[PDB]
């Protein structure tokens, strides 16, 4: 009991936490590994994601060597604040939380040879820039970059504890994604240069693919059916002027309702996405189906249609006959071009 | 070797008084500032502010922190900043700001042998930006960031951009959702008052709003509806059911476009360029339906007591006037 107490008090006599280990003598090498407990939700509107990790850092400090019956020393969180630790920060972090419920979720362990292990539980909210030009058929590689804030490449270097592929471990139930599919992650390290010097940056990229099934049922299928519905009016007799007029205008109103709702499910960006062009083309087709009838009606000589018992009657418009072929063909050709363009990337 | 560094730091901090600026009784201490911008996000028209994250560096010379015999720059623990003097620099138009503290407080203190001190901060600040949205969405914005000293005049402290025009980096790497940074400027000036001049630095941007989404979702559908209302002019005047249903449904469609864009677009309670065009298209479809009522009254009301002239006249004037309305509109706002 008293032996354990003596070593703790003896450790910090003469220690200076303001100086990194091996200052002016060598480079402080830090070995890091990350265990992701949950890859939280990805916010398209904010272009950011949340991640819950157990962050580990290991390094050697000769100033903390001790000899005693125990081989590993467990430090109180108060004592862990009196010892130099790496000032690791996330370059793309936006607002991270270091949990301290019900106690600070930190743990500092010292071995007899002066090797320190520093594990902390963190919730990191990091920005993931996205190119939404192929929405909703887009894929992203959300990064997670961290490194030293104040110590250059010549003072502190970071390394992965194991092979980089195996250093970042994601839990089997880690994924908490509703709209994306976590395909995997790539782990690498690099060098960045700033106005304050060269720094070592450890990067992890999480590769996400958006689920398309929701947009097919909510947006793509109703738009296709509405365009088919507008082209259905070509099979009505030309003498049903009120019927084809109401048919034409109400399909335009139906498309307008669908277009507005489909945009509300997309984050507020001012450039054109892939779904915007599909709706715009569908809008043009429904618009043209009503202009086509205006041309057909302009040549309808008689206001009475054919009767079952049988006088001369109006013939089937040659404009209507061609429209029954051109409009379904042109829309079908557009669909093949549209899907082959985006599903082959 | 390391033990020598420990005593040097103790000597520098022995007798150091953080209540006195460098060269307290002499010339003002020149503070050089440069900013590394990480990202700009949440450019809010409703709140008239933007949020940016930046690396904020400050340079000044403190002869009290000059050391000899060590050919290295002493990067110390970030907690040593509380034991030194730092400028009282604040952002004048800042509404809400904080310093990131994961995994530790993101600040640095680097000492140089001649006494130069580098004090860097990673700050996320929401800065106010008063926006003139009368030309929305065909508008440009100018959002600034004012840097001032709270309690020191130009006799005590001075500001300048270290590196000149290269002081601020990372501007060209920013990608805003609905904007596009055209240019940025650095301004150094003194705020002259009766008491004295106060140093101030100003970093400003010029934001140009992208128009692609508005063309596809606001202007083009409104143009198509207006053109559809002209179809009534090519239907026989006696087709009351066909012409009225076409006329009144385009009015309903325009109302649907206007009301739904009101909810989707940011709440900006004054007349903008987008509202004038939507209102203009609403009037045109209103007049197309009103045109038929005049035609129908002439033939049936005043009839017993030619109606193809009013339709022939409308088949030209309506396409001509709407194109003229577009010509005046797009020349005014562009």
């Amino acid at each position: 009991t008293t032996v354990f107490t003596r070593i703790l008090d003896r450790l910090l006599d003469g220690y200076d936490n303001r100086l990194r280990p091996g200052l002016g003598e060598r480079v402080t090498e830090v070995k890091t590994d990350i265990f992701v407990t949950s890859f939280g939700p990805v916010s398209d509107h904010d272009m950011e994601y949340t991640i819950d990790v157990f962050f580990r850092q290991s390094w050697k400090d000769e100033r903390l060597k001790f000899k005693g019956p125990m081989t590993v020393l467990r430090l109180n969180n108060l004592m862990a604040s009196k010892i130099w630790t790496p000032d690791t920060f996330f370059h793309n972090g936006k607002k991270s939380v270091a949990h301290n419920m019900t106690m600070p979720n930190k743990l500092l362990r010292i071995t007899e040879d002066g090797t320190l292990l520093y594990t902390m539980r963190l919730t990191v909210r990091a920005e993931c820039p996205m190119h939404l030009e192929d929405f909703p058929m887009d894929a992203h590689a959300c990064p997670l970059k961290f490194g030293s804030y104040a110590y250059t490449r010549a003072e502190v270097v970071y390394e992965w504890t194991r092979e980089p592929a195996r250093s970042v471990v994601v839990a089997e139930d880690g994924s908490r994604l509703n709209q994306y599919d976590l395909l995997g992650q790539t782990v690498d390290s690099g060098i960045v240069q700033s106005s304050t010097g060269e720094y070592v940056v450890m990067t992890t990229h999480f590769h996400l693919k958006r689920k398309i099934g929701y947009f097919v049922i909510q947006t793509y299928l109703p738009c296709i059916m509405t365009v088919i519905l507008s082209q259905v009016s070509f099979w009505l007799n030309r003498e049903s002027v009120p019927a084809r007029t109401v048919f034409g205008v109400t399909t335009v109103l139906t498309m307008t309702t669908l277009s507005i709702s489909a945009r509300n499910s997309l984050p507020k960006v001012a450039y054109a996405t892939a779904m915007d062009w599909f709706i715009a083309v569908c809008y043009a087709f429904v618009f043209s189906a009503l202009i086509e009838f205006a041309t057909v009606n302009y040549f309808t000589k008689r206001g009475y249609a054919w009767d079952g018992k049988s006088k001369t009657f109006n013939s089937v418009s040659k404009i209507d006959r061609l429209s029954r072929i051109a409009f379904p063909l042109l829309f079908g050709i557009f669909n093949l071009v549209y899907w082959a363009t985006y599903l082959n990337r | 070797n390391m033990s020598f560094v420990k005593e040097t730091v103790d000597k520098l901090l022995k007798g150091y008084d953080i209540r006195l600026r460098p060269d307290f009784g002499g010339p003002p201490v020149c503070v050089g500032m440069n900013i590394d911008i990480a990202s700009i996000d949440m450019v809010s028209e409703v709140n008239m502010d933007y949020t940016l994250t930046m690396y904020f560096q400050q340079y000044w010379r403190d002869k009290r922190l000059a050391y000899s015999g060590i050919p290295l720059n002493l990067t110390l623990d970030n907690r040593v900043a509380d034991q030194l003097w730092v400028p009282d620099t604040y952002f004048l138009n800042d509404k809400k700001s904080f310093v990131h503290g994961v995994t530790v407080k993101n600040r640095m203190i680097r000492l140089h042998p001649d006494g130069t001190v580098l004090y860097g901060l990673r700050i996320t600040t929401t800065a106010a930006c008063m926006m003139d949205l009368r030309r929305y969405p065909l508008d440009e914005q100018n959002c600034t960031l004012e840097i001032e000293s709270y309690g020191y005049t130009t006799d005590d402290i001075e500001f300048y951009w270290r590196g000149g025009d290269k002081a601020v980096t990372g501007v060209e790497r920013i990608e805003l959702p609905q904007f596009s940074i055209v240019e940025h400027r650095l301004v150094s000036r003194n705020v002259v008052f009766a008491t004295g001049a106060y140093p101030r630095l100003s970093l400003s941007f010029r934001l140009k709003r992208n128009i692609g989404y508005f063309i596809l979702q606001t202007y083009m559908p409104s143009i198509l509806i207006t053109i559809l209302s002209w179809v009534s002019f090519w239907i026989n005047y006696d087709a009351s059911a066909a012409r009225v249903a076409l006329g009144i449904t385009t009015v309903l469609t325009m109302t649907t476009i206007n009301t739904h864009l009101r909810e989707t677009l940011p709440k900006i309670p004054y007349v903008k360029a987008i509202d004038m065009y939507l209102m203009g298209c609403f009037v045109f479809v209103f007049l197309a339906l009103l045109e038929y009522a005049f035609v129908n009254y002439i033939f049936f009301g005043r009839g017993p007591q030619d109606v193809n002239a009013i339709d022939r006249w409308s088949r030209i004037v309506f396409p001509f006037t709407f194109s003229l309305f577009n010509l005046v509109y797009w020349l005014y706002y562009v």
């Epitope: 894929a139 970059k145 690498d188 990229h205 590769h207 | -």
Partner: nanobody, 107 residues
Framework: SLRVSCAAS????????MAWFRQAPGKEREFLAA???????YYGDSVRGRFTISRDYAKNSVDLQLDGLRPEDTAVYYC?????????????????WGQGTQVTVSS
Amino acid sequence: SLRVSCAASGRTFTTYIMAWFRQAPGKEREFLAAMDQGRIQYYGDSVRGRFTISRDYAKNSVDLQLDGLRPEDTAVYYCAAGAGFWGLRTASSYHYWGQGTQVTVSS
């Protein structure tokens, strides 16, 4: 000392990863260097510390600084740009490719 540039036209690559690749005759396509939006620089083992990659975000271009050239480096150099999906070192992750440049080293 040899410096190789790569001009990009028709699209701004501010938020794209611009990389350089080398293809030895008949062997394979080898990753050399890359730089993402955040200016993070990545290098291969065989060219770590030897080659320098720099991106001109204003001019939308990426430059490669070759120093200490060896006869092993005599190959075709390509300029690539992509989103780095499924690793920024794999050649299959890059879509926009330059026409290539031939570098011949004689000693």
